[PDB]
C-alpha cells in the first residue's frame, strides 16, 4: 500500500520482481460529493388512513387504493412495535425510508391466524385458491399485526369456485355453488368464527404494500432532502432511487413528453430527466 513498486512486488509475490509492466489494481475516481435528486412532491402521504385506520374490509371484497403524489415516511411505521411480523421480500424492512416508487397499490383485508404463511409469493390454501392470491413474483412487504386485541360475524371467505384467480384480481359472487338455483346449491360464502367474547383461532389482520416498481413518473418518495446539482464531477448521485457514479452534463437529447428516461444496450440508464427541473 506504500508505492507502486511495493504494489508490483505484492502482486508478483516476490521481493525481487523482474523488469516489465504489470497490472496491479484499477484506478477509480472516488466520488467527491453526494447528489440527491427527488421531485417536489412534499405532500405527505396519509399512511395513517391505512395503519391508524378504524375501518377495514374483508378478504372477499378487499379494497384497493392507488397511492400517488405522496411522501412515504416508513420510519415511525418500521420503528413501531405494532407490526408483529414484517416480512419484506422485494424490498428491505430497514431500507424503506430511502427508496422512492413511481406508483403503488394498498390492499386491506382480514385473514385467519394459521393462514399468515399463505400471504406470500408462491403459496396455496383456501384463500390463495378461491378468494385472493398473490403474484408468484410479488415485490413488497406484508404487514400483519397481533390484532387479537384489535380484531363479530362479519368476515367472509369463499369455499367452492371453478379455479384459481389471477393475482390482485377481484371476484365477487354470492351464488352458484359448486354442486350442492334455490336447490342444495346455495350461498357459497361463510363467515369466520369470531366474536368479541372469543391464540391460533384468534383473528390477525393483514395489510400488504404491493410495491410496483414499474418505470413511471415518480409519485411516492421517501423523506429525503435534495441537494444542489453539480456538473462534470463524479459524485454519488441519486435520481429517484437510481444511484451510481458519473457526470451530469446537459444533454441535447429530445425526450418525448411521456418518455421519462433513456437506456443503452447495457440496460443501464443513459439519461435521466431531472424531476425538479425538466
Amino acid at each position, epitope marked *: 500500500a506504500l508505492d507502486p513498486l511495493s504494489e508490483t512486488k505484492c502482486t508478483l509475490k516476490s521481493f525481487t520482481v523482474e523488469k516489465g509492466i504489470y497490472q496491479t489494481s484499477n484506478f477509480r475516481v472516488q466520488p467527491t460529493e453526494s447528489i440527491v435528486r427527488f421531485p417536489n412532491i412534499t405532500n405527505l402521504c396519509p399512511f395513517g388512513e391505512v395503519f391508524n385506520a378504524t375501518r377495514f374490509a374483508s378478504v372477499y371484497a378487499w379494497n384497493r387504493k392507488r397511492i400517488s403524489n405522496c411522501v412515504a415516511d416508513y420510519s415511525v411505521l418500521y420503528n413501531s412495535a405494532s407490526f408483529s411480523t414484517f416480512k419484506c421480500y422485494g424490498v428491505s424492512p430497514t431500507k424503506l425510508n430511502d427508496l422512492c416508487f413511481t406508483n403503488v397499490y394498498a390492499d386491506s383485508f382480514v385473514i385467519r391466524g394459521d393462514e399468515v404463511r399463505q400471504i406470500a409469493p408462491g403459496q396455496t390454501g383456501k384463500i390463495a385458491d378461491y378468494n385472493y392470491k398473490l403474484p408468484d413474483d410479488f415485490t413488497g412487504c406484508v404487514i400483519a399485526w397481533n390484532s387479537n386485541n384489535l380484531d363479530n360475524y362479519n368476515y367472509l371467505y369463499r369455499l367452492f369456485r371453478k379455479s384459481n384467480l389471477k393475482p390482485f384480481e377481484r371476484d365477487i359472487s354470492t351464488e352458484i355453488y359448486q354442486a350442492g338455483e334455490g336447490f342444495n346449491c346455495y350461498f357459497p360464502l361463510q*363467515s369466520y368464527g369470531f366474536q*368479541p*367474547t372469543n391464540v391460533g383461532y384468534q383473528p390477525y389482520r393483514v395489510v400488504v404494500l404491493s410495491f410496483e416498481l414499474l418505470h413511471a413518473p415518480a409519485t411516492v418518495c421517501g423523506p429525503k432532502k435534495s441537494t444542489n446539482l453539480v456538473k462534470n464531477k463524479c459524485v454519488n448521485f441519486n435520481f429517484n432511487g437510481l444511484t451510481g457514479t458519473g457526470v451530469l452534463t446537459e444533454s441535447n437529447k429530445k425526450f418525448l413528453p411521456f418518455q421519462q428516461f433513456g437506456r443503452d444496450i447495457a440496460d443501464t440508464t443513459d439519461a435521466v430527466r431531472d424531476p425538479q427541473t425538466l
Partner: antibody, heavy 126, light 105 residues
Framework: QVQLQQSGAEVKKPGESLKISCKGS????????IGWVRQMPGKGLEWMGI????????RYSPSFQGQVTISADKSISTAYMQWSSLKASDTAMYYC?????????????????????WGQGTMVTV | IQMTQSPSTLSASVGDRVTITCRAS??????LAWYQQKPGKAPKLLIY???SLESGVPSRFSGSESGTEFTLTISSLQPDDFATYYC?????????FGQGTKLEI
C-alpha cells in the same frame, strides 16, 4: 315483512311465572339474533340477559342468576323470559331485539346490531 | 376511557346546528351503533358500526367519532326535533346507554 311479533302487555304480581312471546312472521325467526334488552319506564334500555334460541344456549346475567330463567320456545315462536319468582323491579316495556343485515345477510344474519324492527312491545307489568 | 355524555338540556331554534358528544366508555373503536328515540316509541338506528347511515331516518341526524370522544350532530334543526336521545356502544359485552337531553322554547 320481517316482524318480531312480540306479545301483549301482561299484568301480574310477584311470585308466579310468565311466558312471553317474540314471534317471527314473514321470515325465518332463527336468522336474526334475539337479544333481550330491558327498558325501565322513564329511563333508557338495559341489557338484562341473552339466550341463543338455536340450541337453548343460555347466559344468565350475574344479577339474575337463580331468580330469572330465560328460555326460548321455537314451536309457536315465543322467546321466553321466565321469572320463576317475579320481581316488582322488572316492571318495564320489554323489547325483543332483532339483528341488522347490511353485509352478507345470508351469511350471519345475527349479532350485527340490537335494533332492526320491534313489535308493539311486551309491556311486562309485575 | 370514561363515559361522559353532554348536555343535560339544549335550547335552540329552527335551522340551528348543534354538536354534542358521547365519549367512549372503553376501547369501542370498531363496533358502536347510534340510536334515535322519539318520546313514547321504540328507538331507531342512527349510525350503526359508527360509519353507516340507517334506513328510515332523515339525513339531518348524523353521528361522528373522534378517538375516545364521539359525536352526535344535527345539521339543520326542525320544529319536530324537540325530543330526547340516547347513545349506545356494542363493541364489548355488556352494552351501556346514554342520558338524554330536553329542549324548551
Amino acid at each position: 315483512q320481517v316482524q318480531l311479533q312480540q306479545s301483549g302487555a301482561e299484568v301480574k304480581k310477584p311470585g308466579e311465572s310468565l311466558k312471553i312471546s317474540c314471534k317471527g312472521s314473514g321470515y325465518s325467526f332463527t336468522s336474526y339474533w334475539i337479544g333481550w334488552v330491558r327498558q325501565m319506564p322513564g329511563k333508557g334500555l338495559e341489557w338484562m340477559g341473552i339466550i341463543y334460541p338455536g340450541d337453548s344456549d343460555t347466559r344468565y346475567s350475574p344479577s339474575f342468576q337463580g331468580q330469572v330463567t330465560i328460555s326460548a320456545d321455537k314451536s309457536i315462536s315465543t322467546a321466553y323470559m321466565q321469572w320463576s319468582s317475579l320481581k316488582a323491579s322488572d316492571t318495564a316495556m320489554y323489547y325483543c331485539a332483532r339483528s341488522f343485515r347490511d353485509d352478507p345477510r345470508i351469511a350471519v344474519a345475527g349479532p350485527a346490531d340490537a335494533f332492526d324492527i320491534w313489535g308493539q312491545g311486551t309491556m311486562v307489568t309485575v | 376511557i370514561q363515559m361522559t355524555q353532554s348536555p343535560s338540556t339544549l335550547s335552540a331554534s329552527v335551522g340551528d346546528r348543534v354538536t354534542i358528544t358521547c365519549r367512549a366508555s372503553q376501547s369501542i373503536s370498531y363496533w358502536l351503533a347510534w340510536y334515535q328515540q322519539k318520546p313514547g316509541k321504540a328507538p331507531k338506528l342512527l349510525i350503526y358500526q359508527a360509519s353507516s347511515l340507517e334506513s328510515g331516518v332523515p339525513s339531518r341526524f348524523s353521528g361522528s367519532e373522534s378517538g375516545t370522544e364521539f359525536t352526535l350532530t344535527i345539521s339543520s334543526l326542525q320544529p319536530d326535533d324537540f325530543a330526547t336521545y340516547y347513545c349506545q356502544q356494542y363493541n364489548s359485552y355488556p352494552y351501556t346507554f346514554g342520558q338524554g337531553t330536553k329542549l324548551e322554547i
